[PDB]
Design a binder for this molecule. Sequence first.
Ligand SMILES: [Mg+2]
Ligand SMILES: [Mg+2]
Length: 463
Amino acid sequence: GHPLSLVTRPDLLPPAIDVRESAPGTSPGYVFLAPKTGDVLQGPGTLQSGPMIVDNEGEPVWFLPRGIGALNYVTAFQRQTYRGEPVLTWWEGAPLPTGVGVGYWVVMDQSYREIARIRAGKGHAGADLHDMQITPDNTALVLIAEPQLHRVDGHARLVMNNIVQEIDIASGTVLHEWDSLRHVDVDESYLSSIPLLPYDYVHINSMSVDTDGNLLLSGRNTHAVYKVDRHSGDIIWRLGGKKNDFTMEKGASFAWQHDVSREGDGTLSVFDNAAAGSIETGGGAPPGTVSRALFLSVDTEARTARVDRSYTSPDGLLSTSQGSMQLLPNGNVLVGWGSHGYYTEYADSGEVLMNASFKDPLVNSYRALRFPWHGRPTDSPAVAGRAGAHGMTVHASWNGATEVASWRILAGDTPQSLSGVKEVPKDAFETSATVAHTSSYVAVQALDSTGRVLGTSKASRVR
Ligand SMILES: [Mg+2]
Ligand SMILES: [Mg+2]
């Protein structure tokens, strides 16, 4: 059971989260999630989906119920930077039965207003859902996944081509385009053939910029990371896979991986699912295999790779798809367990600091990522007053507000004769408070930690 019931916001039913552990040293800031449920037919009836920012207790801070099952599927929510400003980004669109999506990426500023929409170049239906990254030059790496007739074993075969476009965000112009079928051979795939589906031979699911400005592309179904020349498109090297360029130390190989990036300590992070579904692979996976969040010491001059350090779930999870990892500024590591609706923050030493899961066991998030966030909502707090036997309860919330520390409660016989009766700390998304004297109207003011008024609700008739 996940639905959170809110007196002030009957329209918001955010999924509940169970935080089973929260030692001190957990990082500040917020966890960014896009809760979803896979069922096309029943999804909308069991879950309100959309981007969600929660605190270290699992309480929502902002929730935008934008997702509609598989009608408007929302995923891959995070914070990025555009023109030096913090922005929110996610994908919304149509998930297709072939395993890819057709949609676009929303860009929203700190006041929760849409400032741009990042689309695949014209001549394509839209962009796939597995990643989009805003580069230091304010261009977007976008992925297009489309079926294409290709010669596979002398006999033509429908294959899922992956095209990576670099898009100037302000203008929408395509600056660069990289076509996987022109560079990566279909026989590099580990994927078992699934009858009557396009052969999803590479399945790019992460695109990022390395320190030299070239691209790093994670190919799930080739088990490989491609470094690609930013300008020529030539493959610079292959890490992993059937044409591996690197000498791998014991334990450094990954499989069916996600979320690859260059990290500030010089390592390359790889979420190593270590397994996929039974059909897409040969059959089941070896008993006892688990997923790991992996930091690789990759020496590209010597073409060697070894494990610097890794982190596994305290719950023994094997995630057959999705997932994420993030190195945080204090040295902590946050891991989202993908197909499993869990996320875990560790100290560098590997000690579990925070472990959480969706209360509903069918809900998960593609990624779970932590960022500072300062919301600047442009609406007002919502309020509600409920008369009781010997008093009344006042409820207050302000979706998107991050700086509310306290609530001042106002009450009076008329909207124009409200007076301050009480101040209480904020202790939830929606905070409740009881007051002895029941009045006819109420309002609330949100106060920051210095006591300054951030916003005021409308007057609300008690009920
Ligand atoms: Mg070579
Ligand atoms: Mg990552």
